Design a protein around this ligand. Sequence first.
Ligand SMILES: [Zn+2]
Lengths: 568, 195, 61, 193, 424, 145, 96
Amino acid sequence: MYYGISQFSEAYNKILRNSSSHSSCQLVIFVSCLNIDALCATKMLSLLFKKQLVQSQIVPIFGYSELRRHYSQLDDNINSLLLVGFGGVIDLEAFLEIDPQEYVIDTDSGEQSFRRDIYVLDAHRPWNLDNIFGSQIIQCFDDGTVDDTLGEQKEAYYKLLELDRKQRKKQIHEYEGVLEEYYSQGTTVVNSISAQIYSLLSAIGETNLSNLWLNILGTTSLDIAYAQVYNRLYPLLQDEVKRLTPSSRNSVKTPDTLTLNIQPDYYLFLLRHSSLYDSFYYSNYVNAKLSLWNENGKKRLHKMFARMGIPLSTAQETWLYMDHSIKRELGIIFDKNLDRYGLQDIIRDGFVRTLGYRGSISASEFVEALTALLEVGNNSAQKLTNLRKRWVSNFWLSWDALDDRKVELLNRGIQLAQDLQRAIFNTGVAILEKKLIKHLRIYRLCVLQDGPDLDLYRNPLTLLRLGNWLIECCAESEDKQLLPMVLASIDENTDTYLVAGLTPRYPRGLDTIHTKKPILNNFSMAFQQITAETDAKVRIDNFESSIIEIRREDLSPFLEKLTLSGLL
Amino acid sequence: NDDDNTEIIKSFKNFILEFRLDSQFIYRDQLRNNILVKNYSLTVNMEHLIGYNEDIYKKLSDEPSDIIPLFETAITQVAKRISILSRALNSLPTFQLILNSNANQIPLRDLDSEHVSKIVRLSGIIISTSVLSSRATYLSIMCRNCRHTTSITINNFNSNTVSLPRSCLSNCGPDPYIIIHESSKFIDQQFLKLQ
Amino acid sequence: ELLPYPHQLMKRLLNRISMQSQLIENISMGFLDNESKLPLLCMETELERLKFVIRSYIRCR
Amino acid sequence: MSLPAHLQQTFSPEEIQFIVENEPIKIFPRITTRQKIRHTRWQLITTDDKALNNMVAMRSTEVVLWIALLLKQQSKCSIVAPQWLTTKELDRKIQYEKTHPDRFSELPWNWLVLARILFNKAKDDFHDPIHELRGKIQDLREIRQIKVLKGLKYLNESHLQLDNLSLLEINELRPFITEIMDKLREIHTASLT
Amino acid sequence: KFRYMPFSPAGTPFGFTDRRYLTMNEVGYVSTVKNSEQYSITVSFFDVGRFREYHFEDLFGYDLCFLNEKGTLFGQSKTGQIQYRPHDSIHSNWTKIIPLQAGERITSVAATPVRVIVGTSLGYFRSFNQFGVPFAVEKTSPIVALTAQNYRVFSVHYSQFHGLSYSLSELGTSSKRYYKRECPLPMSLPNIKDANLDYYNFNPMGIKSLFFSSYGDPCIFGSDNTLLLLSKWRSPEESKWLPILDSNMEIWKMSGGKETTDIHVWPLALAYDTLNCILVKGKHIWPEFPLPLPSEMEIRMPVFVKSKLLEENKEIQIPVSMAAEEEYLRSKVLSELLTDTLENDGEMYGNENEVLAALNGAYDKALLRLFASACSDQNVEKALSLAHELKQDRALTAAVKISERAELPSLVKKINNIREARYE
Amino acid sequence: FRYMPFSPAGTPFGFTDRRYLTMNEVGYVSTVKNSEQYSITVSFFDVGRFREYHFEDLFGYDLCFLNEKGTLFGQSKTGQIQYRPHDSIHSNWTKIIPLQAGERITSVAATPVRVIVGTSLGYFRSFNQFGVPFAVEKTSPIVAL
Amino acid sequence: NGLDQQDTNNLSHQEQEYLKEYCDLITDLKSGDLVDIDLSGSLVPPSDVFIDVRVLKDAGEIQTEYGVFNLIKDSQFFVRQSDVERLIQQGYLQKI
Ligand SMILES: [Zn+2]
């Protein structure tokens, strides 16, 4: 239990006193690129530091070897380095290859002072104890929830540390078996980074409306990946809202006034700022429920729209341009109709915030815009470095968009989200009509060879969104069971395939006990195993293990090995 | 309802006077601009109107034909309030409204028998432009035998035109109020044709 | 038209700027060896403000 | 160069802001700088730090503006609104201005800049709702401009007087006014023998 | 008769809004809102450097909360539960539940670094240590409120049989001892328009708040809204309560003749020089969750006459005579209190002696202005009396100057004789 | 409680058009109401020590206190306090006390050292014999003084 | 030259050494007295000493007075105003 939940504030104060130098910066921030919750946490830290006026440098990273080379670039004087949700499971110290004896100042009683102290907050679940406990330089923020449950694993690891006889040999072997038990497990997340960050803020008491707002945004970002985690944290967020609701009730809206509400939200992207028809149209859950990919999906969509009695031309016109006379009544109309279609689970309460007369924006809409700006804000390895630079640039653009004044940039991200949803829909319907999915009863396999936007698709987040859409489509087809989702995309500029291994996911609203148990991404372990022997020159530098870049020619033997692999 | 109409006018002026972004009331800004260069015209975005108050925008959409003259009167009163000293007809020409919709554009083709007297957004290419045609903003008349002279301020927001006054109106005839086209104030109109 | 130069005034000002500068230096070096460093930053901000004013005056002259 | 032409002609709005920052202001502390009889002093040449050594959280303290803004950025300072800033005073000034088109009201010249800065930062500490204050000060600005316009009708080659005009407006007006005024003076001098 | 609803110092009634303040103190302000299942406790501080906000939850929904520089208390009267949290919180928080009879209610609870104070509507009184050990249980008259300092503790008791009684206790580090024991309390209960009734539902006794000043002397604030100040409580016999505030009269000064009922005030603490307190522009006689900035009010006695100041008006015009009266009385009382504080405890921040001397100079200036007024009255006895009150030889020279300006020489030579009297 | 003002050894007006404000060993003040003004017959038990005098009172001072240093007249509702020395070698000074809302003077006191006012709201007012307010205190409603 | 047509072709010789010696004179003004203030100091009033700046171009580490600072491409950095100003003079920083 390296960092207790309550001891988070103590660690924070220790970091302060280590870097308590207004004259000289002793803090560096390292953040995983392409993570919304990471961006929210970085905003949190930035506001906290500007409260403390502590000098600091903020760096976005996407690659693990990038982290290593940057660390090499880093000056030793920097006593404060923060890691956001990346590499926690992998032994970063082993990945860093540090000597604590070099780092320790005044070992003696025993205290461990290092000229660089690196504090790691990770969202990944496996949470390697040797990573947590091997080095005191490695400072891991611990939710406790994994840690206490790891008590058996932690004591087994401690025993392994002690023992470096047949009875002791078999005890050590049993401990190793336990290790493999929590090993070979697909990493996930149960804690939105924003959540425990805001918890630490509450421990410090510096929470404002924005802090809670950004925590809401990060959790909303997590929602698709782990719906149940979002649902569990949802009452906590609502209660904190009540804690921070202004006393004034139903005051007349004025430009100065800013309000955040907890009101029913409909699982339609950009619903307020897009139309009704389109919001239904590219909604992955709506598509999967209605099979909108096929023509009969469109037929059923028209049937249900007429069932609400909404005129068509009214439906394809934007929600904001809708007359309020119908807009107020919409919710009860869905209540009457969605159930008849079974589409009622889409209605759920959400957080929508407005300022002045700009309008109300769903947190879901916000995270969609952020993801869009990340995706399309802007030799072969050098080209990949250029793409990493552009992705860092998109990260900075999204960072900037989080600022209130950049409402225009937020609208740009909105437009990018519309375009990306459109393109993802086109690609998905294209592959579905052509049946480009080829399930091998070990994993449903689809590959990207033709069609445009492969440059867009090779951007990892675009591939992830398409994967989420297709997982939703397959899951809503309960006829076929959950199977691993493997997807491979080509870039002719690199002339090599891009692969992401997506774990199967239950459909939303699946509260059954068998659906309560989450699925672990076996794809990661298969990739690690392939890298271990007979590697096809894949790239794992990316902070996501599932996403892997492979030679296009070498992907076919990779599939052969995947068929050979039994862990899939 | 005339008092209610005046209340709606007051609501619209509350819109324009207390709609700001970043402390900036763009409407008074364009107002003072059109005062400096005397263009009695005002530009407004309906998205802003919805953001400030949906209800006024909805009332607009219900029957813009008569909502617009009330808005013009409100803008004229606002200009009188701002650009003229307190306690200091045709003294100040009425401002006219300019709007940008950004909604969908129904094609010129396939326009419905519906949408009559309804605000619409379209696009097309001009094939012809008409010469200017004045329009009686203010009308000056006299009751002929009765000699009663009266003022009329007709707006181009109906249908077709308002018929000439009938009866004496304080027999003088079915149209005693003979128009004296000197005090009467006119504004030019131009006819357009879109392909 | 250029005004007379109150030489005594500005020389006293320069003495003040100096002594403030060495004072800030001492505070900085002592920190290199109170918890709230904000009064030091207030000193620095005052110094910057006055130096900016002096620069403006000199450039104008 | 030594000095850009635009700068020497008139004081920039940022220079006005600096000057206003040099003004003192009433605030409330959130720190007891007083040390119990039962650290580091501010030691400012430009301003007596003895007051600065003497703050106690939530007590009557007057400090120069810029340090107040600096600490208000931090959570440790609470600002006090001026008495003229009160909505009742604003309404009285509005009524005065409407009553007396000839002249202006005795506003504290820096009031415009003060209002700007406080709206930027002190939005929280306004007891009165901020938006109404913004509207009222905007209206006062408009009325002052209009009163200027009538004065422009009465521009003279001999004497120009401005009793109660704010520092901001006079600064922004000085280039054009001086150009016109000196041109008239040159014309008259040429007329004279 | 008496509802005996529990009272917290300047606590905000629950009101229509779910959020509500529990207790207002200079150390910090505490509010809470029920989450529809339980109330959300937040511990907010006026001085951020002293302490950092920690906000948490309790299914108990503690009826009252006490806080001080060392620790904070949370009491639920109906359940008798008491929760303690050190403000530094380095020590573990401990929570107990007091015994109580059927229907017993805890009116108020107080905390000190030396002892922990328990006071119920039944009048049962419990003393506890900072760690949870009960010092003793003892029987007292029911108490409307409690007043606690580091070691100074003031107790005020009420019984419809006993009326209003109050005792002052100086516990110190040890060897607790009472300056006063159940002294009858002079205070005007509100007479038995919706807001005050709601407050009585919250606090029937109608007292807004009760606390110690900046120098720690008692400060009773009630429905009269005119706080009373206790004089020389160090001397028991000499101690007496003096009117120190004219709230409604100061409002009439501020209102300028137009009394407004929306004005309500809650002094979180009393600075010796002037009152620090907060006001409302609204019907509520309790503050609102968005915390307004407290406005420091000058402390003044209600010696002013409504009719006389109305004549002055016909922004409130004050006679230099009557203003001089009020200010020299203020100088006298403040000088006496400050000197007595220097006696029993000395100087809190060193500056006390010179501000006291400046106060003496202001008082002498006041006396000399009164001497000028007496010269206008042209009465030798008044001038002689003023000469007696004068405490400076140079002030006596000033009196000589005033008398010769008034041209009566008999007063001049009497002042001279007073001077030779004062020399030795 | 009704809290009507009290004067030592006073007599209610009642049916009689005349009454005693206060019966004191130094003197007995008998007085009559004229229905527009309050005629006062300030009678002294020792005329040689203080010659009898009697002046009409327009105010109608409800409470009267008399002692060898001076006779004091106060109207409870108005709050104005009138003093006259029995020796009368000093001026007959007159002042007015501040009054709270509905505050009334319950009792009157006169002393050569000081002048004390007893009111309904329990305020104690320390004045000198010349009218200078030495101190002001608030306590329980002082019915008697 | 004071805040930090570089080519002299647009410029004749005489005026070339004129400007060179004028720059030397400016340095002399900086030299000796008045060294405390920057003779070519920013004429904008200083708003805030501590500001966060993203690195416009990657140029490695550059030494400040006391704090190490690496110019890693597009990296936020919230520090005092002197260093950020001087790097803006070279333009290696941006966005304020
Ligand atoms: Zn007629």
